Amino acid sequence: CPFDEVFNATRFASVYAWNRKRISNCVADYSVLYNLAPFFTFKCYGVS
Amino acid sequence: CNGVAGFNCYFPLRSYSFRPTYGVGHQPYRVVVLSFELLHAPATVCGP
Ligand SMILES: *[C@@H]1O[C@H](CO)[C@@H](O)[C@H](O)[C@H]1NC(C)=O
Structure with a gap:
């Protein structure tokens, strides 16, 4: 599903006017969220 | 990760940062666990 x-x-x-999006009925690949650049902040609260 | 911080290189410890202000379900609790072994032995310890 499109990220x-x-x-x-x-x-x-x-x-x-912060932009809203809803995602449902898909498969999420959260590995290709790596080459956004060299150095970025990635903090998540609630899950490992 | 050559012993340095970075993406996919997370330090496996975390802190609590307790303050007198959080809700009733978030303050620290003190826990002690007692383990016995009821078997056949010289019976070193028992009560009054
Ligand atoms: C689109 O975003 C992804 C996010 O990781 C990135 O890898 C990819 O290079 C981007 N597309 C282009 C054409 O740069």
Whole structure:
């Protein structure tokens, strides 16, 4: 399911108009969330 | 990870940071566990 267009997006949204998306009925591959760049912050609360 | 922090290189310890202000279900608790072994032996220990 598409995470490319929500990350490789040309135009983003303002802080007061923070952009919403809902994802359901898909398979999520959270490994290809690695080459966004050299050095980025990845913190998650609740699960390992 | 050559012994340095980074992505996929996480230090396997975490902290609590207890403050008097959190909710009733988050304060520290003190736990002690007593283990016995009821078998055949010289019976070193028992009560009054
Ligand atoms: C789209 O985003 C992914 C996220 O990891 C990235 O790997 C990929 O290179 C991006 N697409 C392009 C054309 O750069």
